[PDB]
């Protein structure tokens, strides 16, 4: 129905942050812009890195804010306001704490889920929760204190792999996710097991 214009990577900038749980998202962009031979240009005017490709004769976008986490809405909002992007026509990639690692899923509006990289968004969208995410799981420590020292580490090898082989799974599913065919791209992707 709606082809997806935009695809965010969610993530923390800077050495001490690459390559920790809360950088996923931003992992599976970079690899799918490496995928497609796309280059992350660093602009200031959209408060990140920005690449382009074209799909179907429209330009798709990628997005990896260089703001903090908490502030990543002002990136997305920067981008979509300037192409006049829906938010219907986004694709946000993000670290999911409920699901294990090796394990990838989508979904279409909803909450934050006490993810404050999505809860910016909402915010700056002006309450536009709308967009579509790929959720790529990164394992809960066990108890609510220790989330915030759990995302801001990083992963074992074990686990690095089990993330690696579910950004695979994801890139596969690709032509169904640029279309904006949801139903097909759920059901191929929700039944992959690493």
């Not at 390559?19 to 809360?22: A, D, M, N, S």
């Not at 309450?127 to 709308?130: I, K, L, P, T, V």
């Given at each position: 129905m709606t082809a997806v214009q935009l695809i965010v990577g969610l993530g923390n900038p800077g050495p001490e942050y690459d390559?920790?749980?809360?950088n996923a998202g931003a992992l599976f962009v970079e690899r799918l812009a490496h995928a497609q031979g796309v280059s992350l240009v660093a602009d200031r005017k959209y408060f990140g890195l920005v690449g382009k490709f074209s799909h179907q004769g429209k330009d798709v976008r990628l997005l990896i804010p260089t703001t903090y986490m908490n502030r990543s809405g002002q990136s997305v909002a920067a981008l979509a306001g300037f192409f006049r992007i829906?938010?219907?026509?986004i694709l946000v990639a993000h670290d999911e704490l409920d699901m294990p690692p090796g394990v990838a899923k989508l979904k279409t509006?909803?909450?934050?889920?006490?993810h404050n990289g999505l809860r910016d968004i909402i915010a700056q969208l002006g309450?536009?929760?709308?967009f579509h995410r790929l959720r790529l799981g990164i394992g809960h420590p066990g108890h609510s204190s220790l989330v915030s020292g759990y995302v801001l580490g990083r992963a074992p090898r074990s686990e690095q792999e089990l993330l690696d082989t579910s950004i695979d799974f994801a890139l596969g599913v690709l032509p169904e996710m640029l279309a904006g065919d949801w139903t097909r791209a759920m059901q191929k992707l929700h039944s992959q097991k690493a």
């Open positions: 390559q920790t749980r809360h829906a938010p219907d026509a509006g909803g909450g934050h889920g006490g309450n536009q929760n709308s």
